[PDB]
Structure 1
């Protein structure tokens, strides 16, 4: 384009234009997208705040002569390999003084973003760089999978030993190199390009090729090794630092695995996540089964799958979601979760309240609801709910939120029936679109899996506390769901809880319940060090529902003995139901000692804010001791810590405990430093 006001970026650097022709942002332009998203982050938090350009810094990372990563400022497109990375230092609302993370990305313009050995080792090197520092690792996927190739240098000289030069159509015995060929190879110092066995047949000496190696690196299995290297590297990263991936253009083979292994993923619409392309699969099946890769790995697959946690309309939207997601996680591994108080202060009642005879969206209880007569506040901070995995297993709702500024993972139950429509596979003619009815308050294979996935994702890397508004009748025990292994997924939940490292709150909501099958997987004893359970005064819980209980312990016979109190079975049947229901109250739960407290929904925000803040504080103190006295149970630690509180402080008063502790952090630190004396030598 001639005569533009400013320089034509796409001309100054043709690679930028190639990227665009490919439907993705040029890799070197992504740091600018992060600056833009970060700026927006501020405007949304505080319209005023005068922001300067030093609030965002991006330094490209490359390997020095010794293979170690260092920072450089160079012209975009100078990358010698197809993988690039940047260290981002950015001041944000949660971290005004700045937080850091790295961004690794394929360069779709460099050999179609293929993963060659060098790209793989660079990617691995960047992952370790992030893990060592404990900072988040953002991956931007735009690739063609493992790099392929043949030893081109052997193509113009190989000879074929036919069964008879007369009719080639008769076949060949092997391929070989003449003494002339062996020479052409030695002339270019490419003798290792081939493995041969010198044998003379009638005419001349023919070196039979037993194996083709090639002089150029990155043709086959060496690309597979590096492929596995970064797969395992990413598997580890996920249990270590916050990991996330943006699928910004196709992501193929190892590319698709990196997306899942990183777990948290945002798919830009129209950018497929595939294993094998449609053309190839069509060859596998014989006919023209698939039209595009989007049928195999588009958002309708992966987002409905749970592989993609969120979809983005474009690259910038993807970056914004990443930035939004990061606002809930620690600046780095083991640092405190980022407190961020906003307009919606902790001290207030909860407005929206569910009713037994009225349908509702659990999201209203979570983030509040907008009504004609004004906004009704929910349990958590207004506008702080960030839902994820929203395109899969709608039976359960998961996301991040803030409670008076405290970030945490939230799991709620969708009470409304879900219409899960499964498309028909083109590969099968006899296939027809299928509709699955997923009853509310019932775990299914998908929703059980999602529940566990969320717990693990809240725990690993995010290191967030969690609240589960437990409200399930049980798991689906029908044949299809049972055959579909609902037990394995249900069990994944218990496993996830056992592994949780931050405070957990299990709370049965106002019109909610827990029964024999559901309570099993969320009881506080699964992980007593982190879990606490609470039931609303209007919640219910017992092994069986009232109907089921009477149908077994208040049979027709016993129902008649009661006729001796005053045809009339209808009303008496109702009486027995109420008799049973009077057993499933929060009061019995308190009496039997299975919950910490029974609560009143409207007061829940106030109670949980201080309960959580109080816990974050004691936990902090407990960890400090776990690095001193060492050998000591949690019971002994938490007890010693509480022995330091002033005698008149009421251990049961959350607000008092939290308040006294924050007033004496340094004083408590002195008592700890002085405890080092307990250095059993």
Structure 2
């Protein structure tokens, strides 16, 4: 029966599957809407202690397929799913969407045939993805599965006979497998003749139906699960370019399960749940030897989070879900909505407190989110508490996150100035093969950090649809043998390709003690995408083709020194010490932000402590002008960006200074509806 004397009903007995799920260290699929409700709740509590919710703040509906295969909402009993894939549509009012926002969750039912993917789960999962794409609404996937479903035609097992080379002597081989008349019948009576393909023969006496192929009556044995999982691999791929996708790995993801996790890109892994391609036993079986002890060895976090396959880890499901929800709070409600402004106690109008010093090491995170100290909080460039770092465990050379600038959400990339000690494990399959330690210097791009940067940019672009700031501060790419061989050129280029695709505003900003130097500058220069990119250098930054040291090695050598000695010494070789020094200073006079301005390679030179005030409005002004540029784009007789921009600006009042971000932003917001009348007025002129 039950556990006997509990105060409320025992749920794991009302529905024994809930227990099955738990036995396998995961939340029962029908309990996940409850986890999301719990997390939305916490989101509110953290934003405003005092606000009063009701249960109408959060709604979950199961989605199922109707009589014509369309999805609808139903309210039914947890456990009634006939297939092993389940979905909910969720409408939730959040701090960022007080009147409510929507998304779908799809989820493997780990208790239904080991949460394996058969054809029916695959067609369902695909319908759910399309339902989300069509509405523009984000698609959360909760992966707990065993990969594709394996089978065999059980109905043939008790039937088939064998053609012995000679009987009384199995021993020596067989010719082929077959059925008898009475085999054939047993199939016809069970309505199942389609289960084999055969050929009549008679052999000395009887008649024999040679099996030539076994098809099986039960759907979901072999290749139909393959077509199955192809469909949804492709379906996820497309998703990722279309709507916010994200995946929580909740008890294990195997096979197509693993690839689904990656194709939707954004993934959070729960400690102790593996993302694998095949299991340890099956690999050991192939290799013939017990090399791997657990799946955790192959697809646990020490692998997938160190990869960048896993963007975050989580301590359990609920923590998983809190992350999804928080990641999701930077993201527009549907495809092509404005990004969700959300202002907190940290208004835009303040100095930036925390400032790097030249001789002093620091964590760039301090510059981004500020820093607790002995004598109080020192604010950084973005809103206190608003920094959601992702890919934290891979390629620690860059740091990438989401954050808010006075409410405005954006992707952020900073450069980590401390040396990373990246440690690569021995691979147990290799007889002997030791742990290997990689020193990764700071403000140098390596293959992995270049990859991560590119990756980050695409993930801001793709469903997140965010603007972006890059706090650029690289001295260059590593171009020594190991890193060339590992294709630093390949991953460097990804960065350019991603910049080219980017569809929202981008600020590049060389910070106070920062630099950009040859290659690193190039990969990030505005001309790569003049439609979206703008560059700023702090007054205490440096940029140019070489370091002053490198510069001197080539354009201020012995002869050039001595000759300067020749004119700065009334006396005139024991001055090298200081003349070398002079030359270094002479180079460095070339690398100033003043010169960047002079050559018009940057938009402004900034002062760090004034940066937040500047970027808040610059960004705000830009989102407003973008929105207008779009409105215009949807006319008929289309035109260059330059032309559209030009004629939007011809709408501003004559006194408005186009260069003044606050003024322009404020006037646009005072006039959206007037601006809108103006478009309406064009549309009529724009038949011809």
Q: Is the pair's TM-score, using the shorter chain for normalization, greater than 0.5?
A: yes
- Distance (whole Å) between structure 1 residues aligned to residue 31 and residue 475 of structure 2: 50
Q: Return the offset for 1:630.
A: 4.4
1:8-29 deviation line (CA, Å, top 9, x unaligned): 0000000000000011000000
1:23-53 deviation line (CA, Å, top 9, x unaligned): 1000000000000000000000000001111
Q: Return the offset for 1:564.
A: 2.4
- SS for the counterpart of 2:422 is strand
Residue 285 of structure 2 is matched in structure 1 by 283
Whether the 8 Å CA contact 1:546–1:577 is kept in 2: the answer is yes
The answer to whether the aligner puts 1:205 opposite 2:207 as a matched pair is: yes
Whether the 8 Å CA contact 2:368–2:381 is kept in 1: the answer is yes
- Distance (whole Å) between structure 2 residues aligned to residue 596 and residue 201 of structure 1: 91
Q: Return the offset for 1:514.
A: 0.5
- Distance (whole Å) between structure 2 residues aligned to residue 518 and residue 621 of structure 1: 33
Change (3 A) 1:386 1:630: farther
- SS for the counterpart of 1:656 is helix
- Distance (whole Å) between structure 2 residues aligned to residue 472 and residue 588 of structure 1: 19
- Distance (whole Å) between structure 1 residues aligned to residue 74 and residue 183 of structure 2: 45
Q: Return the offset for 1:656.
A: 0.2
- Structure 2 residue aligned with 1:636, among 638, 643, 648? 643
After TM superposition, the structure 1 stretch with the greater mean CA deviation from structure 2, 629-638 or 46-55, is 629-638
- Distance (whole Å) between structure 1 residues aligned to residue 637 and residue 407 of structure 2: 32
Whether the 8 Å CA contact 1:136–1:243 is kept in 2: the answer is yes
- Distance (whole Å) between structure 2 residues aligned to residue 487 and residue 44 of structure 1: 44
1:173-228 deviation line (CA, Å, top 9, x unaligned): 11000111011001111000000011111121000000000000000100000100
1:104-154 deviation line (CA, Å, top 9, x unaligned): 000000000000000000000000000000000000000000001000000
- SS for the counterpart of 2:78 is coil
1:272-307 deviation line (CA, Å, top 9, x unaligned): 000011000001111100000000000000000000
1:297-344 deviation line (CA, Å, top 9, x unaligned): 000000000000000000000000000000000000000000000000
Whether the 8 Å CA contact 2:637–2:686 is kept in 1: the answer is no
Whether the 8 Å CA contact 1:134–1:332 is kept in 2: the answer is yes
1:445-496 deviation line (CA, Å, top 9, x unaligned): 0000000000000000000000000000111101001000010000000000
- Structure 2 residue aligned with 1:156, among 158, 161, 171? 158
- Distance (whole Å) between structure 2 residues aligned to residue 170 and residue 556 of structure 1: 89
1:579-604 deviation line (CA, Å, top 9, x unaligned): 00110000100011100001000000
Whether the 8 Å CA contact 1:463–1:501 is kept in 2: the answer is yes
Q: Return the offset for 1:163.
A: 0.6
Residue 364 of structure 1 is matched in structure 2 by 366
- Distance (whole Å) between structure 1 residues aligned to residue 49 and residue 483 of structure 2: 50
Gaps of 5+ in 1: none
1:547-584 deviation line (CA, Å, top 9, x unaligned): 00000000111011010243111100010000001100
Question: Normalized against structure 1, the TM-score is what?
Answer: 1.00
Q: Return the offset for 1:517.
A: 1.2
The answer to whether the aligner puts 1:603 opposite 2:610 as a matched pair is: yes
Residue 177 of structure 2 is matched in structure 1 by 175
Q: Return the offset for 1:609.
A: 0.2
- Distance (whole Å) between structure 1 residues aligned to residue 362 and residue 201 of structure 2: 83
- Distance (whole Å) between structure 2 residues aligned to residue 361 and residue 162 of structure 1: 76
Task: Tell me the number of residue pairs that the alignment of Structure 1 and Structure 2 aligns.
Answer: 681
Whether the 8 Å CA contact 1:90–1:99 is kept in 2: the answer is yes
- SS for the counterpart of 1:375 is coil
- Distance (whole Å) between structure 1 residues aligned to residue 269 and residue 306 of structure 2: 12
Whether the 8 Å CA contact 1:107–1:113 is kept in 2: the answer is yes
- Distance (whole Å) between structure 2 residues aligned to residue 96 and residue 67 of structure 1: 33
Residue 91 of structure 2 is matched in structure 1 by 89
Whether the 8 Å CA contact 1:463–1:502 is kept in 2: the answer is yes
- Distance (whole Å) between structure 1 residues aligned to residue 282 and residue 588 of structure 2: 60
Whether the 8 Å CA contact 1:329–1:462 is kept in 2: the answer is yes
- SS for the counterpart of 2:199 is strand
1:241-283 deviation line (CA, Å, top 9, x unaligned): 0000000011000000000000000000000000011000001
Whether the 8 Å CA contact 2:517–2:547 is kept in 1: the answer is yes
Question: Normalized against structure 2, the TM-score is what?
Answer: 0.99
Q: Return the offset for 1:629.
A: 4.3
- Distance (whole Å) between structure 2 residues aligned to residue 118 and residue 400 of structure 1: 37
Whether the 8 Å CA contact 1:537–1:587 is kept in 2: the answer is yes
1:71-95 deviation line (CA, Å, top 9, x unaligned): 0000000000000000000000000
Moved beyond 6 Å, runs of 4+: none
- Distance (whole Å) between structure 1 residues aligned to residue 201 and residue 357 of structure 2: 89
Whether the 8 Å CA contact 1:629–1:678 is kept in 2: the answer is no
- Distance (whole Å) between structure 1 residues aligned to residue 51 and residue 171 of structure 2: 79
- SS for the counterpart of 1:588 is helix
Residue 235 of structure 2 is matched in structure 1 by 233
Whether the 8 Å CA contact 2:515–2:542 is kept in 1: the answer is yes
- Structure 1 residue aligned with 2:600, among 593, 597, 620? 593
Whether the 8 Å CA contact 1:130–1:136 is kept in 2: the answer is yes
- Distance (whole Å) between structure 2 residues aligned to residue 556 and residue 419 of structure 1: 39
- Distance (whole Å) between structure 2 residues aligned to residue 510 and residue 664 of structure 1: 37
Q: Return the offset for 1:631.
A: 1.5
- Distance (whole Å) between structure 1 residues aligned to residue 308 and residue 497 of structure 2: 19
Whether the 8 Å CA contact 1:449–1:490 is kept in 2: the answer is yes
Whether the 8 Å CA contact 1:124–1:233 is kept in 2: the answer is yes
Whether the 8 Å CA contact 1:83–1:119 is kept in 2: the answer is yes
C-alpha RMSD over aligned residues: 0.6
- SS for the counterpart of 1:371 is coil
Whether the 8 Å CA contact 2:308–2:393 is kept in 1: the answer is yes
- SS for the counterpart of 2:460 is helix
Q: Return the offset for 1:239.
A: 0.2
Whether the 8 Å CA contact 2:343–2:407 is kept in 1: the answer is yes
Q: Return the offset for 1:678.
A: 2.6
Q: Return the offset for 1:414.
A: 0.2
After TM superposition, the structure 1 stretch with the greater mean CA deviation from structure 2, 283-292 or 560-569, is 560-569
- SS for the counterpart of 2:347 is coil
- Distance (whole Å) between structure 2 residues aligned to residue 550 and residue 344 of structure 1: 46
The answer to whether the aligner puts 1:663 opposite 2:665 as a matched pair is: no
The answer to whether the aligner puts 1:504 opposite 2:490 as a matched pair is: no
Q: Return the offset for 1:54.
A: 0.5
After TM superposition, the structure 1 stretch with the greater mean CA deviation from structure 2, 627-636 or 297-306, is 627-636
Whether the 8 Å CA contact 1:366–1:380 is kept in 2: the answer is yes
- Distance (whole Å) between structure 1 residues aligned to residue 635 and residue 679 of structure 2: 8
- Distance (whole Å) between structure 2 residues aligned to residue 509 and residue 432 of structure 1: 40
Q: Return the offset for 1:169.
A: 1.2
The answer to whether the aligner puts 1:575 opposite 2:578 as a matched pair is: no
- Distance (whole Å) between structure 2 residues aligned to residue 223 and residue 646 of structure 1: 63
Residue 544 of structure 1 is matched in structure 2 by 546
- Distance (whole Å) between structure 2 residues aligned to residue 592 and residue 456 of structure 1: 31
Residue 376 of structure 2 is matched in structure 1 by 374
Residue 517 of structure 2 is matched in structure 1 by 515
1:344-398 deviation line (CA, Å, top 9, x unaligned): 0000000000011000000000000000010000000000000000000000000
Gaps of 5+ in 2: 569-573
- Distance (whole Å) between structure 1 residues aligned to residue 271 and residue 198 of structure 2: 50
- SS for the counterpart of 1:558 is helix
